[PDB]
Paper text:
DUSP22 is a small phosphatase containing 184 residues, and the sequence contains a catalytic domain as well as an N-terminal myristoylation site. This enzyme is broadly expressed in different tissues and plays important roles in the regulation of signaling pathways, such as inactivating the T cell receptor (TCR) signaling pathway, activating the JNK signaling pathway, and regulating the phosphorylation of focal adhesion kinase (FAK). The phosphatase domain of DUSP22 consists of five twisted β-sheets and six α-helices, and the structural scaffold is similar to that of DUSP3 (VHR), while DUSP22 does not contain an N-terminal α-helix surrounded by the N-loop. In this region, the catalytic activity is facilitated by C88 in the P-loop and D57 in the D-loop, and the hydrogen bonding network is formed by D57 in the D-loop, S93 in the P-loop, and N128 in the N-loop.
The crystal structures of C88S, C88S/S93A, C88S/S93N, WT_VO4, N128A, and N128D were determined in this study. All of the structures contained a ligand, PO4, VO4, or SO4, bound to the P-loop in the active site. The binding of the pTyr-like ligand was representative of the first step in the catalytic reaction, and the binding of vanadate represented the second step. Unlike Q262 in PTP1B, N128 did not rotate to stabilize water during the two catalytic steps. The DPN–triloop interaction was maintained in the catalytic reaction, suggesting that the stable interaction among the three loops was necessary for catalysis. Structural alignment among N128A, N128D, and WT_VO4 revealed that N128 participated in forming the conformation of the D-loop.
Author numbering: -1 to 155
């Protein structure tokens, strides 16, 4: 469906879901989620015992998300390196959250944005960044993802 079927594993320790999944204590415990990246209009820490990164962003092609790629990647990566699980979510888990996860995948692999989106869709079929976000991912692939990959190597080995 258009808001998924529950939070979905994309990579070990990295999940995408909708806003309901993000407060579902059963899903959070089953998937051992200790970090939540909430990227939506009124994003704020909700549940105790979880570490949050909140990004106020609209699901509009006018919304810039590139400014937030580096902080999102750091947050996801530091959680995954300590063996913990991170959930990235927006309202529906289709566009804003997916775009941040694509940028992460692109940085930890040699994938362009389309192969990263394929990876997301294998776990979460509804994934579909809006056209403004697709444009931003294409510019990231052409001019910046190589800088982010080098940064990741120098920072984390
Ligand atoms: O709540 V999202 O529309 O960016 O899938």
């Amino acid at each position: 469906g258009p808001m998924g079927n529950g939070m979905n594993k994309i990579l070990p320790g990295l999940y995408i879901g909708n806003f309901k999944d993000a407060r579902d204590a059963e899903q959070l415990s089953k998937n051992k989620v200790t970090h939540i990246l909430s990227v939506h209009d009124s994003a704020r820490p909700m549940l105790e015992g979880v570490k949050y990164l909140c990004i106020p962003a609209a699901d509009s092609p006018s919304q810039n998300l590139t400014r937030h790629f580096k902080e999102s990647i750091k947050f996801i990566h530091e959680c995954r390196l300590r063996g913990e699980s991170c959930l990235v979510h927006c309202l529906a888990g289709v566009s804003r959250s997916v775009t941040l996860v694509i940028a992460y995948i692109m940085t930890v692999t040699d994938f362009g944005w389309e192969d990263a989106l394929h990876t997301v869709r294998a776990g979460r079929s509804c994934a579909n960044p809006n056209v403004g976000f697709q444009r931003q991912l294409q510019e990231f692939e052409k001019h910046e993802v190589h800088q982010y990959r080098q940064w990741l190597k120098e920072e984390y080995g």
